[PDB]
Amino acid sequence: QPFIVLGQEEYGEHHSSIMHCRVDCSGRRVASLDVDGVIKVWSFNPIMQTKASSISKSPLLSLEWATKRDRLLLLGSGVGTVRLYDTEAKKNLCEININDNMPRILSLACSPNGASFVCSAAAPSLTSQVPGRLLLWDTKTMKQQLQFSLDPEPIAINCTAFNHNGNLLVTGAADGVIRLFDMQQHECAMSWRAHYGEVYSVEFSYDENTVYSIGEDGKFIQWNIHKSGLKVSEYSLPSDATGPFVLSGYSGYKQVQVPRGRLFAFDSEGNYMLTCSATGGVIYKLGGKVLESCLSLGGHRAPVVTVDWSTAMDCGTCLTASMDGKIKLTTLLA
Numbered sequence: 001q002p003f004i005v006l007g008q009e010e011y012g013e014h015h016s017s018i019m020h021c022r023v024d025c026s027g028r029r030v031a032s033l034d035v036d037g038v039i040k041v042w043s044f045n046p047i048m049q050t051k052a053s054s055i056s057k058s059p060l061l062s063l064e065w066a067t068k069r070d071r072l073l074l075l076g077s078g079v080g081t082v083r084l085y086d087t088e089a090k091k092n093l094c095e096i097n098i099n100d101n102m103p104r105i106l107s108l109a110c111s112p113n114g115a116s117f118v119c120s121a122a123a124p125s126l127t128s129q130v131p132g133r134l135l136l137w138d139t140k141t142m143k144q145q146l147q148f149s150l151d152p153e154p155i156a157i158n159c160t161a162f163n164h165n166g167n168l169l170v171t172g173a174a175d176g177v178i179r180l181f182d183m184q185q186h187e188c189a190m191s192w193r194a195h196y197g198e199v200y201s202v203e204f205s206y207d208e209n210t211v212y213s214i215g216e217d218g219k220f221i222q223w224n225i226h227k228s229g230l231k232v233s234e235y236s237l238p239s240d241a242t243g244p245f246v247l248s249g250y251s252g253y254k255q256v257q258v259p260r261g262r263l264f265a266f267d268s269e270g271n272y273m274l275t276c277s278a279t280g281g282v283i284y285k286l287g288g289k290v291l292e293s294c295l296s297l298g299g300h301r302a303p304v305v306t307v308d309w310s311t312a313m314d315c316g317t318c319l320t321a322s323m324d325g326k327i328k329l330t331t332l333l334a
C-alpha cells in the first residue's frame with residue numbers, strides 16, 4: 001500500500017454546499033468558501049479551530065492564498081472585484097474593481113515568486129460561448145498591469161495554474177481549449193482543443209513535461225507540453241468525478257452544482273491523484289490499459305464537489321468537501 005491512513009476528522013462549520021477549499025502555503029490553514037457566501041479560515045493541526053469567519057454581502061466565486069505572505073488571501077467576487085484579506089489582522093487590506101461588463105471572478109492564481117497574480121473575469125452565464133478576460137496584476141501595488149488577448153475570441157477561463165518557477169501559466173476555458181502562456185513574454189505559447197465541453201481543472205506534472213486536465217466530457221487527460229495537443233494518456237472517469245453534483249431529498253427539491261473548485265489534487269511527488277466521488281475521495285496511482293483506484297477515503301454522506309491535497313512536515317493531508325457542507329480531512333503517511 002502506498003499510504004498509511006493515520007486518521008480522518010471533520011470540519012462542520014459550513015451549513016451550505018462547498019464551492020472551494022484550499023490549504024495555505026505553510027500547510028497549516030484552510031480557507032473554505034460555501035455557496036451562501038460564508039468564508040472560513042481555520043486550522044487543523046494540532047486540532048480543528050476556526051481562526052476567522054465572514055459572510056460576504058456580495059457573491060464570492062474564487063479564492064487563492066498568497067505564495068510568500070502566508071496570511072494573505074485573495075477573494076474574487078461576482079460583482080467585478082478582488083478583495084485582499086489579511087487572515088492574521090482579520091481585515092481587508094483592499095478591494096479593487098477589475099473593470100466592468102465581466103463581473104464573475106472565476107479563477108485566481110498567485111505566481112510562485114510572490115510578485116504577481118492572474119485572475120479570470122467573465123461575463124454573466126447566458127450560453128457556453130460567454131466572453132471573458134485574463135488579467136495580470138502586480139502584488140506590490142495591487143494594480144492591474146495588462147490583459148492577455150484570448151484567441152479566437154474572448155472566453156471564460158475556468159482554471160489557472162503556474163508551473164514551479166512561474167514562467168508558464170496553464171489555463172482551461174469554457175470553450176474546451178487549454179492555453180499555455182509564456183509569463184516573461186506575455187503571450188500564448190500553445191493552445192489546443194482539450195475537451196468537448198468546459199475544462200474544469202489544469203495542473204503541471206511534477207516533472208513539468210506534461211499538463212493534466214479534467215473536463216465536462218468526463219475525461220482525465222495528460223498532455224505533452226512540448227507537442228501541442230499530443231496526448232500522453234487518457235482516461236474516462238466515473239461520472240461522479242465531474243458531476244453535475246446533485247443532492248436530492250424526498251421533497252422534489254434538489255441542489256445541483258457544476259464544478260467550480262479544484263476537481264483533482266496531487267501528492268508531493270505527483271505520483272498519485274485525488275478525485276471526487278459520491279461517497280468521498282478516490283485516489284488513483286498515475287502512469288498505470290485503464291486507470292484503477294488504489295485508495296477510497298470514504299466518510300461522506302453527500303457528493304464530494306472539490307478536493308485538496310497538501311504535504312507539510314513529511315505528512316500529507318487530503319481535503320474532501322461535500323454538498324452538505326462537510327469537509328473531511330484525511331491524514332496520509334507515505
Ligand SMILES: O=C(NC1(c2ccc(Cl)cc2)COC1)c1ccc(N2CC[C@H](O)C2)cc1
Pocket residue numbers: 065066067069072074084093094095110114117139140141142
Ligand atoms: O499587501 C499588499 N501587497 C503585497 C501582497 C502580497 C501578496 C498578495 Cl496575493 C497581494 C499583495 C505585496 O507584499 C504584500 C498591498 C496592500 C494594500 C495595497 N493598497 C491599499 C490601497 C491601494 O489599493 C493599494 C497595496 C498592496
